[PDB]
Paper text:
In order to understand the basis for specificity and structural changes in the binding of the selected DARPins to mTFP1, the crystal structures of the mTFP1/DARPin 1238_E11 complex were determined. The mTFP1/DARPin 1238_E11 complex was obtained by mixing mTFP1 with a 1.2-fold excess of DARPin 1238_E11 and subjecting the mixture to gel filtration. Gel filtration analysis indicated a homogeneous 1:1 complex, which was used for crystallization as described in Materials and Methods. We determined the crystal structure of the mTFP1/-DARPin 1238_E11 complex in two space groups, to 1.6 Å (P6522) and 1.85 Å (C2) resolution, respectively. Both complex structures are structurally identical (Cα r.m.s.d. of 0.3 Å): The overall fold of mTFP1 exhibits the typical β-can motif of the GFP family and undergoes only minor structural changes upon DARPin binding. Similarly, upon mTFP1 binding, DARPin 1238_E11 remains structurally unchanged and exhibits only minor differences in the N-Cap region (Cα r.m.s.d. of 0.45 Å). DARPin 1238_E11 binds into a cavity along mTFP1 including β-strands 1, 4, 5 and 6, comprising a protein-protein binding surface of 790 Å2 and thus similar in size compared to other known DARPin protein complexes. Residues from the N-Cap and the three DARPin repeats make specific contacts with mTFP1. Interactions involve hydrophobic DARPin residues Trp37, Val38, Phe71, Met103 and Val104, two salt bridges (Asp69-Lys104 and Lys106-Glu15) and an arginine-arginine paring (Arg15-Arg178) stabilized by Glu90. DARPin 1238_E11 binds along the barrel of mTFP1, using hydrophobic and charge complementation.
Here, we report the selection of designed ankyrin repeat proteins (DARPins) recognizing mTFP1 (monomeric teal fluorescent protein 1). Here, we report the selection of DARPins recognizing mTFP1, one of the brightest and most photostable FPs in the blue-green spectrum. We characterized these binders both biochemically and biophysically and determined the three-dimensional structure of one DARPin-mTFP1 complex. The two DARPins we report here bind specifically and with high affinity to mTFP1.
Numbering used by the authors:
A (entry chain B): 2 to 164
B (entry chain A): -7 to 61, 65 to 220
């Protein structure tokens, strides 16, 4: 439930104020505070790329698989933005590698669209589905092609070969 | 051109293009719309041409989308700090909830950026709980009434509230409450309480609203005025 410390923690994560995040958590701030569009401190730290804060939030009980009102998880956000180490930390903490948002996109869809090859490879290694279709029938390969990410498209096309 | 307008003439030109993409899901139905247009930021006008790229035909009233398709397009007097134009080139984002009289709800967020002489929007919109036999899902709306948005600062950012009316076929209306949070991506001079008067209309559309042109005018003023 909403709390005053929760609101401040959301803002400190949103603003990238790492020291203030630590102060607020020390004083009892709810690490799973959620704003009116479903964002949590972990979402915000993952998007902003603040790895140390992602780690302490996970260590103190943040839900790694929280989704916002559009179905977006912290792993979606880190894959979108190209934050490789955060992707690794989220997966290690149990993030659903194949989570789908409200239009059916997975983290691999987003890494492919936004051109983050190293993240594509990490997601694949942890069992991301190359053939995943969003709600419009599109695969990560389709999105890589659409955005001219030819090296990623080759990786995905090779990985789509079945035996 | 006034003193206050000139301060952002270097960044925001008298004519600016618009490019946008919306990912949406209304009563479970996913869709994508892309838009291109242009507007006059200091005159407070903007026009966007929209195309449904995925999820056609839309099974619901297009009017629940049009206000999602940028307060940089607002005429501002010099004595009211312009939260939106000051935020550029870095830009701003907004989050909005629209609560409908029959308990339908829309939650939408948008990222407003700038590239060369264009604004770029990335929009995500979710509509839920619309009654199937209500005017949104039955496509029995005609448009939005003119409105007045109340702008005021809370928690270091700008809030906007609208007590809105969605007009219905046959002359009725449907109350809709808008609440928006506008967040500049850098420090800007914050305004006092003020109003923004809006008028939004669909100028053209094809039968299924796969192609739509939206027009909006917006002007800021003080409550006394």
């Amino acid at each position: 439930p909403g709390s005053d410390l929760g609101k401040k923690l959301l803002e400190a994560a949103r603003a990238g104020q790492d020291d203030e995040v630590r102060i607020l958590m020390a004083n009892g701030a709810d690490v799973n505070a959620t704003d009116w569009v479903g964002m949590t401190p972990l979402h915000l730290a993952a998007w902003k790329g603040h790895l140390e804060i992602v780690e302490v939030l996970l260590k103190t009980g943040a839900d790694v698989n929280a989704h916002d009102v559009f179905g977006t998880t912290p792993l979606h956000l880190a894959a979108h933005r190209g934050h490789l180490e955060i992707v690794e930390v989220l997966l290690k903490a149990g993030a659903d590698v194949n989570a789908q948002d409200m239009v059916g996109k997975t983290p691999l869809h987003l890494a492919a669209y936004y051109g983050h090859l190293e993240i594509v490879e990490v997601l694949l290694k942890h069992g991301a589905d190359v053939n995943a279709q969003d709600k419009f029938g599109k695969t990560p390969f389709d999105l890589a092609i659409d955005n001219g990410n030819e090296d990623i498209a080759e990786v995905l096309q090779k990985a789509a070969k079945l035996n | 051109v006034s003193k206050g307008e000139e301060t952002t003439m270097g960044v925001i030109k008298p004519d600016m293009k618009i490019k946008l993409k919306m990912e949406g899901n209304v009563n479970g139905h996913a869709f994508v719309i892309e838009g291109e247009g242009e507007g006059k930021p200091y005159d407070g006008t903007n026009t966007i041409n929209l195309e449904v790229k995925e999820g056609a035909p839309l099974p619901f009233s297009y009017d629940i989308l049009t206000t999602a398709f940028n307060r940089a397009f607002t005429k501002y007097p010099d004595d009211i700090p312009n939260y939106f134009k000051q935020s550029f080139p870095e830009g701003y984002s907004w989050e909005r909830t629209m609560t409908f009289e029959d308990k339908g709800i829309v939650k939408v967020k948008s990222d407003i950026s700038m590239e060369e002489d264009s604004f770029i929007y990335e929009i995500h919109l979710k509509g839920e709980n619309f009654p199937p036999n209500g005017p949104v899902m039955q496509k029995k709306t005609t448009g939005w009434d003119a409105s007045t948005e109340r702008m005021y600062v809370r928690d270091g950012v700008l809030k906007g509230d609208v007590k809105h009316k969605l007009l219905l076929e046959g002359g009725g209306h449907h109350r809709v409450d808008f609440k928006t949070i506008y967040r500049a991506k850098k420090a800007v001079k914050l305004p006092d309480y003020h109003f923004v008067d809006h008028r939004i209309e669909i100028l053209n559309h094809d039968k299924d609203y796969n192609k739509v042109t939206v027009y909006e005018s917006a002007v800021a003023r003080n409550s006394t005025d």
